[PDB]
């Protein structure tokens, strides 16, 4: 039967588990489309990880240029404003190294050039685990978000190939095989992390981005963010959870039953 | 509050004040965004008549020139494009539309790019519509890239229309930001609002048929049944013979919302 | 027309049965020539190898289009992509001989760099119009969680290319030089999570795993320890659907269902 | 050594460089450019019954200042203008790339279109604009010139646009390239006789040459063809730059012929 | 031919080389980076402002890349450089600046960038546009060559209602500029004498502090004086700024364009 | 400053001699490490084979950057591009050994498909920052009538990437991973029509013709009765300028002259 084969493939051939995927790890990259996405999607989990003495590094794809409705606030000023804010925010969470790709907000390319930037940082830092948005989240209308999710996944895979971006090799950045990928802002989580006793810090980590979260905007966003973490919290029977989708690496390619975990 | 279901209910009713009962009721000006000449007529022809008849000003933006839409080996794309503009003029006349913006990107060649966003943003800023209609880019098995990109780009351009740093030369020359009230996505597998068009079906078909280059009698043998089947698909969801479906969601739902599928 | 049907279900059924003349009985029964489009060397074999053999045996002329050269598929730092592309061409010439395939078009886009553009559509179109195949097989570009841009793109470009092959204004220089418009009879999509037609391959399973292993550069002994169970498992996912040990699954739809059809998922 | 290479190792005829040509392709950016740049010479070659085929890169869509006239209608107009203009010159085949006026890409895709028409028609000569004309401000012109030269070279390479080879169209070696609209011609054609007819074939492009526009352009065109005439002591000329293939590449003394 | 040429220029085109900027009321100066207008034609900008010509800038890029300071992020440089251009503009009597905001080193060469320039030209209706000569020999900065070409292209395409047609549908109508003047040119045919404005120009350039430190100025002051002397000497003055102006015609299919 | 010069000629002389300290007697004199950038395999050897050997001999470390893979350089219908590129990699490894070159960076863009983009500048700038060379050699992109885009682009991109290698906001991830900005001392352009410095290669000519000839795929004998005559003529075009038999010509300029300098052609 298929069922026995599926069970055996997962337990005996792949050895993939969902009890804690995040355990073997002392270095991880958290990849974000915009300054503030790491905090919003997985702030809780970044602290929880900070404390185990996990080196948590960010890559931020874009500069946040466009994130204002203020006509006398230029894009260049805002980028500088949001750089501060993410440093303020990252300290609150225990992150101590941010890479800035500096692609303009709303103009993140979907290209080999961007994959190379991520490949270079991966091959350099050799993290055990990479986090990134789930690019298959229903109704996600931000291309910066979609593109981030796809390039993170492809870059993880390609970092392992020496014919991919072969100049890194020629200068002694060697192929690197990441251990796991964990996708946040996801509709299909299979691993939830409890953040009931870290919720308050996260909400604090998030309001540091003052440019994005004013008094008035925060009217809507506090409940929206309270609802979301409940949406996840309720899957494992706590108040506040953060959801991740973790799969076997094989399941990201030609796997007709990927949705069965 | 206690549970997710309560939170979710509180977020819709109170925080955003989200209602599906009557989302187009307040509109005064709408833009209907179409990949090719005929998509407004096919996708939402009855609703556009209803809107016009209520005195809503309905404006089209047509993304492409329909250059490819022929199997006639002696109808060149240019001649077809001219034929199809005259067909949309007549089609839009029947539905009471008086203004059409032609972007003129070649059929099958619609880019997915900042440049096309700026086109839509320009027109949105200038017209200041309360509502914008466009295809649903997540329609399953949709295989026309002009269709998917129209969906995506119309949704992106609505959001970007509000940001003064986005296409900043608009602002410098007098086109201020604009905040649209609603987006409604047609050609959708997931509607949450249905318009009864039973009384306007025959008019819809005549406005579609105005696209003569596209609908020969022979093709109409498959297409009338196809069109009736689709509107019955929609109609049946609110218990009427013929309907037109729309997906309308709060703005927040188009972004980082993992329970977006719960309306 | 279609005015005397009373319900959506009645209308859907009549549209399928009478207007579109669609069934999933034996979709491939009348195939004289088919093209199997694959992203990378080895894709047709893994995705639909059993079925290609079964078609070959019935005297169906089966032709590959291979989208990429496979340049990137090695962790061996001392193996260059050029050499690998040369190796993989020989592995496919040998896979294809096993399965009965006599012709391959190599588009040669570099592995991981397959563009999504009109220029690629034009290649696929030139060939489709040359060969005039009855059927075209390609990966399903909606496979959930499919993370390879080359796969997603081959799928979308296959479907689009099939459609645009019939348009004289698409790539009009093909027409000016004696390559007329062509109307393919069916598309079938492999590597699909929504198959609606399963081919029994229980018998030919061993010949299939051997057309696959022939891609030695991709399948060393230590990798086959994972890939053999994955492959058998995928094949019992499909066969189970029709209660056989081993199947290959395909999604087939009427051409109309690939455009503006909100009930396309009801087949 | 310059001479023991030109008229010895390569055999470079500047006396009558066309003459052996049975079939030639004229590549224009826009409808009308063939007639403007080399209409006199086109007629010459037709009268000698050499087969002259046009490839028009673009649709001429943007060529009007009339706010009432769509670019689609203009393209249809200019297509029939060109069919007429060509009828007057002995041209009985025009290939239409249908890239939009102002939007001609500079890419592999476009080289492929040209390479496909080259490999199918197996021309002896290709005519095209000189992409190095000083102060040429039209990107469609510059890019036509460069893509023409590059496609001619690439048509000879089987690994270039290889599907062409898979479906029957073989590699092809053009004999000569002739660049018109050139500041540096090394071959001039007396067209003093054909001049009233050149101006006729050009004027058939009614959309482009209103009586009022023609007030400026008749003098402009006459001045241009004199500029060429003067160089071989005739009244009306059309200039071409022809060089041996090799000079199109790493040749520091290219400007010496 | 010599007869034809003369007649064309003098009767048909009625082409002035005596004083081509005489009729100007509004001109746009198109610069690749903040400081190019001041560097390439800053004395002419002041001469024009003083005579009541409205001089408007279009700046193509943000100057994001113009620092060797590892701790100065490109965004901060851009903010700093807008402040600097506004200080520099004040001194030259320029009141309006359009910022395209394409990143320094990344200016596209595309229809999209043409549409920005066309929109501005349609809106502003200038009698003149100034831009770098895209054919300056040995020019190595892609942002400079492309401003050149794109300004020249945009000026011509601003007149075609099918080019960027949404402009016209929204009532930015087509517009025909009277002249183009190319600065940073090896081939000038009009020199303005700026001898008595030289000092003010050097001041307007130094307002771009981020770009002209003291050490840097040791090289650039002599460079700039050498360049104004190259031009000045052509009309027997100490310091000139050169421009190439041709008839619109000569920008296209004109094999004898190099005889002016 | 520069207020007491009286004419442009006086100003230009002083600017060259005193402010820029531009010397054309011995431009390469202080070289410890140079990079030679070539569009295709064989371009360094053809362009400057003699000079690279004169440099090697002196203990100058010469590093090659090859922009493309030479995929397209064949008329042989049964020789694929992949195999050609594998062949040319070894033709260049030999050719280089002959000239004393001990490192080659292969960017591996496909021949005829070298992009003119920020991405390629990033590759150059990566290698320049890593190697920290005193000098860079590249084809002169302004060669009149040069009709190969790969060649034009390589020269423009070389000149740009040398300027941009200095700027820490250009390709800022390099800086973040320990690759700092670098300032090359000189640029020398080969394949040039306007050289201002000629190297005598008369006693190295034979060795050059041989290192060129290691590119067997490119130079048959049919080809060579036409390409030895061509090369001997080119090296005499340069040699005759300094009255030796065979020379290699270069264009050298102060970095200032690569930007907004209307008197660039005066040197
Ligand atoms: Cl009937
Ligand atoms: Cl009927
Ligand atoms: Cl009937
Ligand atoms: Cl001092
Ligand atoms: Cl001093
Ligand atoms: Cl001083």
């Amino acid at each position: 039967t298929f069922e026995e084969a599926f069970n055996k493939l997962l337990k005996e051939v792949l050895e993939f588990n969902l009890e804690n995927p995040f355990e073997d790890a002392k270095k991880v990259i958290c990849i974000e489309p915009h300054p503030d996405d790491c905090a919003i999607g997985m702030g809780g989990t970044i602290k929880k990880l900070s404390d185990e003495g996990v080196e948590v590094i960010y890559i931020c794809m874009t500069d946040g240029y466009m994130g204002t409705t203020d006509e006398k606030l230029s894009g260049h000023e805002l980028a500088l404003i949001r750089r501060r804010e993410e440093e303020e925010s990252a300290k609150l969470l225990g992150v101590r190294k941010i890479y800035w790709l500096n692609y303009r907000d709303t103009e993140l390319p979907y290209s080999r050039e961007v994959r190379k930037d991520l490949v270079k940082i991966i091959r350099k830092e050799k993290p055990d685990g990479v986090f990134a948005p789930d690019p298959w989240l229903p109704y996600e209308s931000h291309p910066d978000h979609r593109r981030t999710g796809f390039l993170a996944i492809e870059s993880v895979a390609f970092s392992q190939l020496p014919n991919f971006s072969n100049i890194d090799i020629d200068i002694g950045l060697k192929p690197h095989s990441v251990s796991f990928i964990a996708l946040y802002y996801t509709h299909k989580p299979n691993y939830i992390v409890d953040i009931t006793d870290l919720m308050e810090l996260k909400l604090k980590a998030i309001r540091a981005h003052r440019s994005q979260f004013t008094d008035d905007i925060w009217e809507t966003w506090e409940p929206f963010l309270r609802t979301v973490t409940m949406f996840y919290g309720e899957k494992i029977g706590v108040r506040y959870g953060e959801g991740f989708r973790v799969m076997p690496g094989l399941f990201y390619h030609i796997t007709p039953f990927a949705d069965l975990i």
Side-chain angles (χ1 to χ4, degrees), chain A:
Chain A
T1 88
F2 165 72
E3 210 195 353
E4 288 174 50
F6 182 85
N7 279 341
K8 193 178 163 84
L9 175 78
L10 271 188
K11 172 214 157 55
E12 274 157 23
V13 182
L14 298 178
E15 296 184 29
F16 158 89
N17 87 295
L18 277 165
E19 260 72 71
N20 62 324
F22 301 162
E23 174 175 49
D24 290 355
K26 49 269 190 228
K27 196 196 273 157
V28 307
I29 306 194
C30 295
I31 308 191
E32 66 186 358
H34 304 117
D36 88 2
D37 288 308
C38 276
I40 298 161
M42 67 172 301
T45 309
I46 285 175
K47 194 62 180 50
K48 179 143 187 54
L49 294 181
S50 269
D51 306 336
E52 316 294 2
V54 191
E55 220 198 321
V56 168
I57 301 158
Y58 292 173
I59 304 165
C60 193
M61 302 314 288
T62 76
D63 52 15
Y65 183 106
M66 292 289 178
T68 195
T69 73
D70 176 0
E71 305 195 28
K72 13 217 278 57
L73 183 51
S74 87
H76 313 288
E77 207 190 308
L78 183 69
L80 192 59
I81 286 169
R82 304 190 56 171
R83 289 231 174 170
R84 289 158 185 5
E85 295 179 342
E86 182 83 278
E87 277 148 352
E88 204 179 284
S89 182
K91 182 138 55 235
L92 290 179
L93 311 166
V95 182
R96 268 162 276 271
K97 203 200 264 167
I98 306 170
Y99 285 83
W100 293 106
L101 306 187
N102 297 136
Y103 294 103
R104 186 170 290 176
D105 202 0
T106 77
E107 319 185 341
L108 185 65
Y110 183 73
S111 65
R112 181 191 52 203
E113 180 173 12
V114 184
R115 283 189 200 96
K116 289 182 188 176
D117 298 318
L118 294 179
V119 163
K120 174 150 74 194
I121 304 175
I122 287 172
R123 281 173 179 177
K124 170 72 171 189
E125 292 286 3
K126 325 170 80 87
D128 304 284
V130 168
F131 302 71
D134 188 339
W136 298 290
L137 170 72
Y139 299 113
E140 167 55 66
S141 312
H142 208 318
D144 290 348
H145 279 227
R146 306 185 298 252
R147 296 176 162 200
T148 297
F150 296 117
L151 299 164
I153 296 163
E154 294 144 18
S155 301
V156 164
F158 294 172
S159 283
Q160 292 198 2
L161 315 178
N163 300 350
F164 188 98
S165 198
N166 62 305
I167 304 311
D168 289 333
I169 263 63
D170 294 6
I171 74 166
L173 292 165
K174 299 155 76 44
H176 175 69
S177 287
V178 167
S179 279
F180 72 83
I181 295 164
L183 304 173
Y184 67 97
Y185 287 146
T186 177
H187 176 225
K188 297 276 158 166
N190 52 16
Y191 184 59
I192 312 263
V193 174
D194 191 15
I195 57 136
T196 323
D197 267 37
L198 275 178
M199 181 70 190
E200 297 307 300
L201 185 67
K202 174 174 174 173
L203 293 183
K204 207 149 153 153
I206 287 161
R207 263 210 101 154
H209 298 269
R210 291 210 283 230
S211 54
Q212 304 311 295
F213 305 105
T214 59
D215 280 3
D216 209 65
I217 284 164
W218 198 247
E219 276 317 82
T220 298
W221 282 76
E222 184 180 19
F224 176 77
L225 294 160
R226 287 203 170 276
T227 297
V228 170
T229 56
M230 284 178 92
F231 169 83
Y232 291 126
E234 226 142 289
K235 282 200 212 316
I236 62 155
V238 280
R239 272 215 102 219
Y240 299 131
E242 281 183 344
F244 302 92
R245 169 159 196 94
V246 181
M247 299 196 285
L250 188 55
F251 277 36
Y252 295 88
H253 191 47
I254 76 179
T255 303
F257 50 76
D259 69 342
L260 288 174
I261 64 163

